[PDB]
Design a protein around this ligand. Structure first.
Ligand SMILES: *[C@@H]1O[C@H](CO)[C@@H](O)[C@H](O)[C@H]1NC(C)=O
Ligand SMILES: *[C@@H]1O[C@H](CO)[C@@H](O)[C@H](O)[C@H]1NC(C)=O
Ligand SMILES: *[C@@H]1O[C@H](CO)[C@@H](O)[C@H](O)[C@H]1NC(C)=O
Ligand SMILES: *[C@@H]1O[C@H](CO)[C@@H](O)[C@H](O)[C@H]1NC(C)=O
Length: 159
């Protein structure tokens, strides 16, 4: 709730979505959510989760393959502010290949091609019926997504 997103040990970028708000995406070795769950019970939590998911897919023009692969993820809600944390399993090349068809991998792809992090590397390529999948490796342990403003985008929000 107090640590900085724009820390030197982190790779960060902020994107605008609308209604004078956006998303702050952080690649960090510091965790923000400690429960291993993501409620999504009521439609409000689901709508706010879908709104953030579709914003990243539309903005980054992503196409996530279906490899039946799962990226460990927990979410939290504090009012209208959503927090999504991915516990990244992309340390090695085989780790990236076993987690290639996930949204977090697609975000690592976006961080790589626009050079928002010099740690990410294209470690594996997987052919399929869709576009050739690129699996990216990174030493970062966590990928954090938060709905915040341009004024406060360098500071983590309190979930
Ligand atoms: C992610 O990692 C944090 C810190 O190690 C842990 O508290 C949390 O339960 C983990 N979440 C999932 C979904 O594994
Ligand atoms: C972020 O929260 C505001 C309310 O504070 C809401 O109006 C906006 O739709 C949210 N943005 C996203 C992408 O969820
Ligand atoms: C994060 O932790 C991993 C685990 O050893 C390490 O390899 C990596 O260098 C760390 N990244 C940063 C930015 O400290
Ligand atoms: C949600 O985020 C907005 C924008 O960062 C902030 O103004 C508001 O106080 C937050 N809600 C809380 C902290 O309950």
């Amino acid at each position: 709730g107090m640590p900085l997103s724009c820390s030197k040990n982190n790779s960060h970028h902020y994107i605008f979505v609308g209604n004078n708000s956006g998303l702050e995406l952080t690649l960090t070795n510091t965790s923000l959510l400690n429960h291993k769950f993501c409620n999504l019970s009521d439609a409000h939590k689901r709508a706010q989760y879908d709104m953030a998911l579709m914003s990243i897919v539309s903005t980054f023009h992503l196409s996530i393959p279906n490899f039946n692969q799962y990226e460990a993820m927990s979410c939290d809600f504090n009012g209208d502010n959503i927090t999504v944390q991915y516990n990244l399993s992309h340390a090695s090349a085989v780790d990236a290949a076993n987690h290639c068809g996930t949204v977090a991998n697609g975000i690592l792809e976006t961080f790589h091609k626009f050079f928002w992090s010099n740690n990410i590397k294209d470690a594996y390529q997987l052919p399929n019926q869709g576009k050739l999948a690129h699996c990216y490796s990174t030493s970062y342990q966590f990928l954090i997504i938060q709905n915040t403003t341009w004024e406060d985008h360098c500071t983590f929000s309190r979930p």
